[PDB]
Design a binder for this molecule. Structure first.
Ligand SMILES: [Br-]
Ligand SMILES: [Cl-]
Length: 220
């Protein structure tokens, strides 16, 4: 427990970061700006053969390394800052209460089980738009629950979905959807055992690209 605090500046609830910012809202704004810039290039990268914990670490590093020393490192892992201090957070405990996200080494076991399900399904390549959306919703819910990093989980997870989609010929567009909707769908699937909303959300954000790109390509 005592190591949790070493993610933050002394006497503050602000995450240590490479910009030196000590206001948590301003940190958020700068972090949003830096990761948006990095996501533009990461979208053009070729996809790996496995969608696993190493790939998630790769995404997290690529998106957050300008902001966080521990970019690419999961929160179950002791991390030592340049300042000498060592941080980790095996359990999310807001206000001292347990919330139902993966704890400790459960993070790695959940990500493993997710790679194994995806690998066995050829990473969802060769499926209809609807069937892809229905599986992709389940993947998204698995990642919600894993919450592998200290911070940056949402953007990391969305990017993982974009790349899985892209490798299957689909644009996954989270800009189509409101925050309130994503929260509703996440809680339904995680707390109320109700997959339908996340399924309907993925049907709304999964758009076939193969044919459009081929048209564009030939016109050019
Ligand atoms: Br982003
Ligand atoms: Cl400090």
């Amino acid at each position: 427990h005592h190591m949790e605090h070493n993610y933050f500046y002394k006497n503050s609830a602000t995450l240590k970061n490479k910009h030196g910012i000590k206001n948590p809202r301003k940190l958020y704004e700068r972090c949003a700006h830096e990761t948006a810039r990095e996501a533009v290039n990461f979208r053009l990268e070729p996809p790996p053969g496995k969608f696993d914990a190493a790939y998630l670490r790769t995404i997290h590093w690529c998106l957050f390394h300008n902001t966080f020393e521990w970019a690419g490192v999961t929160r179950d892992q002791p991390f030592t800052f340049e300042d000498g201090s060592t941080a980790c957070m095996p359990a999310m405990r807001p206000k001292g209460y347990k919330v139902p996200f993966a704890v400790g080494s459960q993070i790695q076991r959940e990500l493993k089980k997710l790679e194994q399900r995806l690998t066995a399904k050829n990473n969802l390549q060769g499926l209809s738009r609807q069937e892809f959306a229905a599986n992709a919703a389940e993947v998204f819910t698995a990642l919600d629950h894993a919450h592998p990093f200290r911070k940056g989980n949402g953007r990391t997870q969305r990017m993982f979905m974009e790349k899985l989609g892209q490798a299957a010929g689909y644009k996954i567009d989270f800009s189509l959807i409101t925050k309130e909707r994503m929260t509703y769908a996440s809680i339904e699937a995680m707390q109320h055992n109700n997959p339908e909303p996340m399924k309907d959300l993925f049907e709304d954000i999964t758009h076939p690209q193969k044919s459009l790109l081929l048209k564009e390509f030939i016109s050019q």
